[PDB]
Amino acid sequence: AKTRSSRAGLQFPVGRVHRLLRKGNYSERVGAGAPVYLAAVLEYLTAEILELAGNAARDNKKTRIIPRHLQLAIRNDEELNKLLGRVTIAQGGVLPNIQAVLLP
Amino acid sequence: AKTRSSRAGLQFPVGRVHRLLRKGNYSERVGAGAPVYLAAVLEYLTAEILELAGNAARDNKKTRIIPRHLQLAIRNDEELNKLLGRVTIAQGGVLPNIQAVLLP
Amino acid sequence: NIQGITKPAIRRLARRGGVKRISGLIYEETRGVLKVFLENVIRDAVTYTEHAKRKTVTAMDVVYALKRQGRTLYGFGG
Amino acid sequence: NIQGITKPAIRRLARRGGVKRISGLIYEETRGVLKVFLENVIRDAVTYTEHAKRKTVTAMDVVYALKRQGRTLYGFGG
Amino acid sequence: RYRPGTVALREIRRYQKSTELLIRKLPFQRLVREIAQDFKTDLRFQSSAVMALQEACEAYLVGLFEDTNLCAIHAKRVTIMPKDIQLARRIRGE
Amino acid sequence: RYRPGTVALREIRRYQKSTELLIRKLPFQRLVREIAQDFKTDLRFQSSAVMALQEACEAYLVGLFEDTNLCAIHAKRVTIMPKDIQLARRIRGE
Amino acid sequence: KESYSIYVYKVLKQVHPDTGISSKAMGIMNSFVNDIFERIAGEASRLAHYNKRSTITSREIQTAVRLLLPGELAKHAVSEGTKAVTKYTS
Amino acid sequence: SRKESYSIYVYKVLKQVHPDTGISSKAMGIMNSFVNDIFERIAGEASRLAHYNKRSTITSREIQTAVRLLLPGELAKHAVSEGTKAVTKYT
DNA sequence: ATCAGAATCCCGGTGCCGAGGCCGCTCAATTGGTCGTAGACAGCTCTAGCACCGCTTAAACGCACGTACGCGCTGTCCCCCG
DNA sequence: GGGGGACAGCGCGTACGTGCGTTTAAGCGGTGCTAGAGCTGTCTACGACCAATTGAGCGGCCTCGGCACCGGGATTCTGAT
């Protein structure tokens, strides 16, 4: 027996994603490739954010990712910021940004 | 044959609303009262807009409602303007509004 | 083709917006803003067309594109 | 209870927002717009609670209320 | 000669009362086609599709000019400038 | 004696480079309870519900203060005033 | 095609017996009904799944209309819906 | 009462991209919220596409189109590559 | 004021062309019986929210005080309005 | 082409940043209680479905009288005087 995640070479759960599509009732039927495609996309997005968040953790000399690192990774990337525009990351804080007219 | 619409004393179609709920991928099952309630609420909203639009038509010396009259009815009342905030009426135009500082 | 959006047309749009005086640099700025808006809506409308395997962008494709960008349009079939 | 939102707290929020100099009338204005925001979120959160026939507002009720007002919050179960 | 501002206010009063489209149709159609060419070649367009695009764009520009105007007034000016358009869009999230 | 503005800018750098909640928890909790009383009586609250409200409110106010600041700078001022808050909210659609 | 044109006209005669409506205005009304129908049904759907229910009741519709519609429009819409369900059950 | 989450899969992907980096429970909650949110957005758009084309089945084509409509710029380009590769390997 | 003269209201006409009145009919909503299963509801339980209490201590507070930024006033020059 | 709004300079002076030790109460940890969320069981009463139908809804067709826009006359705009 080979799990559908292992058959697609993915770490994300294809079987669970399939069930969650079927029991959203989002449609009457769900194709066999739809959960595989969706799982791969979710995995890709998580990898991107985690990669960028781990870099932010290393640049603050930390070995564990915290919400601050996730906020730094998302707001410092034009595409991730645009995707997560109407999102609030709890305990994420803000980018350091001061308007030039206010400076010394 | 007493139509569910006539049983509920409504002009809006309960049977059609029921079918649209059942085929619209909203839930596995739909209660018997849900289409009746939805049809009524929906008809109430149409009556409210049409009454206000007909008044605007009579004020503008017309016997036919046009998109302008609908825009006038919606935009000049708070709750209807809030409900349809992120909406554009085609050929509705805008409310006559000039900032006081621009006046001679 | 962007120059087809003439200064008088932009002035008319500003007049409906209640604008009394307009700087000379507004016309080029408006053309740029309109181009971005159109590109964004047309991109999505064409995506819907390609998904339907059609070669003709329909009013419905435009309506759907506007709806998903939070600019719902009434009067064109939804 | 609205006075519990003290001037120092409103200055701290403004400092995170990058504001250097604050007028004395801003504190009362901020208290107002905070009250409106809270009322709108709490109203919807309580509606969800009543629909669940519960007597306790849950974090999920708040998350749902924020989501439907276009202020999605991550970190409370999202 | 009418003083500067008199005819401008008369035009505001005329266009705020009307609902007609203010951009010429054929130039707008040409712009829509040329922008769509970059996404897909040999694209046809329903007449109503172009009209839907025109209605939405005009409503977008009119709404933006309103917000731009209000920013000019905030700077105590009666003239709209690019900085006003930029502020309005930034605050709107665009 | 630090000149007016020096300590203000030091506070901006302190609070922008940190993530903690800036409103005292107990007073905020009292406000939440007091507001909810008008919608239904004898309401209980999970502690996580109040904290989720806190986080959202602080994020909303910080975001509004950012736009309010831009309005002030637009009017050639470095001081935020109620008219700046009003403009930001109006343009945002609030 | 299917439209709500006939029903919008029936209600127009009830509110304004001597008032007609243009085809463009009718299209706006059709778009309006479809839009609000979808908002309510979508909220009722999320509200069912959030409570782990499989069934869309009048209760879900009422709550959706109690979250979507603003101020007194919700108050009157709820009255209309409740009256209709009561009349239908009898 | 068991409450399912994507924590185990977040951890797996983290160990691939940054083997020596861990994650806090708060940060894990953010990631879980993120996956659930994106999953809803894509599935909801795919649902609309199917009904808009009178279809009763959500297939990989609907997911791909939804990914084009929601993900901005190059995030869409790479996400589509990942999804296509996974479907090919699975078949 | 003071009158000249366009801009705009307002009145009678008109025909014409979309809205509504009207016919034919068909298919989707209706009526009624049967199944099943979801959820409406009773009891348990033990979890979490709540009220209450001690102490503390860090934070809010009033005002005295300096000061510099907000805005009133004047003058210009040339950009847009017409 | 002109003229009136945008920009610059400035007085100025009053609105508010900073301290400081004062006046306030946040908050953190402990102590009990119990409203009530949630689980378990049931019974079952309402919905899905299957089969006949029929009567509104919708495609088509006409006539009409509401209204776009034509010519005239008026009044109150506004600018020269």
Q: Is B5 exposed, middle or buried (0-12, 13-18, 19+ CB in 10 A)?
A: buried
Concatenate the DSSP letters of all residues of H19-48 into one string: TT-EE-HHHHHHHHHHHHHHHHHHHHHHHH
* Strand J contact residues in chain E (70-89), C-beta within 7 Å: 72, 76-79, 81
Alpha carbon distance A97, C5 (integer Å) = 37
Q: Residues 6 or more apart from B32 whose CB is under 8 A from it?
A: none
**H or E, element range at D30:** helix D26-51
Alpha carbon distance D74, H35 (integer Å) = 10
Give me Rg for the CA atoms of chain B. Answer: 19
3-state secondary structure of H55: coil
Experimental method for this entry?
cryo-EM
Q: Pick from A35, A14, A79, A41: which is nearest to H78 by CA?
A: A41
Which tokens go with D73?
């919050």
Alpha carbon distance A90, D76 (integer Å) = 8
3-state secondary structure of G21: strand
Instruction: With an 8 Å CB cutoff and a minimum of 3 pairs, decide whether chains B and G touch.
Output: yes
CB distance H49 to A3 below 8 Å = no
CB contact under 8 A, D74 and A87: yes
The Cβ of residue C54 has, within 10 Å, a number of other Cβ atoms equal to 14
The Cβ of residue H9 has, within 10 Å, a number of other Cβ atoms equal to 22
Q: State whether residue C12 sits within 8 Å of chain B by CB.
A: no
Alpha carbon distance H49, H68 (integer Å) = 12
**Bases along strand I below 7 A from a protein CB:** 7-8, 18-20, 28-31, 38-40, 48-50, 59-61, 66-71, 79-82
Residue with tokens 């044109």: G5
Q: Residues 6 or more apart from D54 whose CB is under 8 A from it?
A: none
Alpha carbon distance F83, C45 (integer Å) = 40
- A10-48 b/e with 16+ CB inside 10 Å = b? bbbbbebbbebbbebbbbeebbebbbbbbbbbbbbbbbb
Q: Residues 6 or more apart from A88 whose CB is under 8 A from it?
A: D66, D71, D72, D73, D74, F55, F56, F59
CB distance H27 to A69 below 8 Å = yes
Instruction: Please name the member of E17, E55, E78 whose beta carbon is closest to the beta carbon of B96.
Output: E17
Q: Which residues of chain D make contact with H33, given a CB cutoff of 8 A?
A: 73-78
CA angle F25-F27-F29, nearest 5°? 65
Q: What are phi and psi of A87, to 5 degrees?
A: -115, 140
3-state secondary structure of A5: helix
First and final C-alpha spacing in chain E: 41
- G59-G60-G64-G65 Cα dihedral, nearest 10 degrees: -30
Closest residue (Cα, C1') to J56: B3
Q: Which residues 17-36 of F are in CB contact (within 8 Å) with E?
A: none
H-type alpha helices, E1-94:
6-15, 25-37, 47-74, 82-92
Closest residue (Cα, C1') to I20: G20
3-state secondary structure of G78: helix
The Cβ of residue E44 has, within 10 Å, a number of other Cβ atoms equal to 13
- Which three-class secondary structure string do you get for F13-67? HHHHCCCCCCCCHHHHHHHHHHHHHCCCCCCEECHHHHHHHHHHHHHHHHHHHHH
Give C33's DSSP letter: H
CB distance B79 to G73 below 8 Å = yes
In chain H, the residue whose alpha carbon lies closest to the alpha carbon of A89 is H30
Q: Residues 6 or more apart from C28 whose CB is under 8 A from it?
A: none
Q: Which residues of chain F make contact with D5, given a CB cutoff of 8 A?
A: 23, 27-28, 31
Q: Which residues of chain C make contact with E5, given a CB cutoff of 8 A?
A: 20-21
Instruction: With an 8 Å CB cutoff and a minimum of 3 pairs, decide whether chains E and F touch.
Output: yes
Which chains neighbour F (Cβ–Cβ under 8 Å, 3 or more pairs)? Answer: A, D, E
Instruction: With an 8 Å CB cutoff and a minimum of 3 pairs, decide whether chains E and B touch.
Output: yes
Q: State whether residue B25 sits within 8 Å of chain H by CB.
A: yes
Alpha carbon distance C15, E8 (integer Å) = 8
CA angle H1-D43-G47, nearest 5°? 45
Domains with residue ranges and CATH for chain E: 1-94 (1.10.20.10)
| Number of compact structural domains in chain B | 1
In chain C, the residue whose alpha carbon lies closest to the alpha carbon of H60 is C51
- Which three-class secondary structure string do you get for F70-89? HHHHHCCCCEECHHHHHHHH
Q: State whether residue C70 sits within 8 Å of chain B by CB.
A: yes
Amino acid at A18: H
In chain E, the residue whose alpha carbon lies closest to the alpha carbon of C19 is E69
3-state secondary structure of C73: strand
Q: Which residues 70-89 of F are in CB contact (within 8 Å) with E?
A: 70-71, 74-76, 83, 87-88
CB distance G55 to B29 below 8 Å = yes
List Cα–Cα distances, H62 to A5, B38, C48, C67, H71, in angstroms: 20, 30, 10, 18, 14
Range of the domain at A32: 1-104
List Cα–Cα distances, A29 to A39, B20, E27, H3, in angstroms: 18, 18, 45, 26
* Strand J contact residues in chain B (3-62), C-beta within 7 Å: 3, 5, 13, 22, 29-33, 57, 61-62
Alpha carbon distance A19, A13 (integer Å) = 10
Strand positions, DSSP E, chain B? 29-30, 64-65, 87-89
CB contact under 8 A, E59 and B88: yes
- Identify residues of F whose CB sits under 8 angstroms from chain A CBs: 5-6, 9, 12-13, 16-20, 52, 55-56, 59, 62, 69-70, 73, 78
CB contact under 8 A, E22 and C14: no
Q: Residues 6 or more apart from B45 whose CB is under 8 A from it?
A: G32, G33, G36, G73, G77
State the smallest CA–CA distance between residue C24 and chain E in angstroms: 8
Alpha carbon distance G39, G58 (integer Å) = 15
Alpha carbon distance B35, B21 (integer Å) = 8
Which chains neighbour A (Cβ–Cβ under 8 Å, 3 or more pairs)? Answer: B, D, F, H
Instruction: Please name the member of D20, D71, D75 whose beta carbon is closest to the beta carbon of F60.
Output: D71
Alpha carbon distance C7, C10 (integer Å) = 5
CB contact under 8 A, B28 and A25: yes
Residue with tokens 């016309």: C27
Q: Residues 6 or more apart from H89 whose CB is under 8 A from it?
A: A7, A8, A9
Which tokens go with D4?
């519990």
Q: What are phi and psi of C46, to 5 degrees?
A: -65, -40
Q: Which residues 34-73 of G are in CB contact (within 8 Å) with D?
A: 43, 46-47, 50-51, 59-60, 63, 66-67
CB distance E4 to C17 below 8 Å = no
CATH number at residue A50: 1.10.20.10
Q: Which residues of chain D make contact with H29, given a CB cutoff of 8 A?
A: 74-78
List Cα–Cα distances, B43 to B14, B48, B95, in angstroms: 11, 9, 26
- F56-71 b/e with 16+ CB inside 10 Å = b? bbbbbbbbbbbbbbbb
- C16-C20-C23-C28 Cα dihedral, nearest 10 degrees: 0
Fold for the domain defined by C1-76: Histone, subunit A (1.10.20)
Q: Which residues of chain B make contact with H47, given a CB cutoff of 8 A?
A: 25
CB contact under 8 A, D51 and G43: no
CB contact under 8 A, A53 and H27: yes
Domain boundaries, chain D: 1-76
Alpha carbon distance B65, C13 (integer Å) = 25
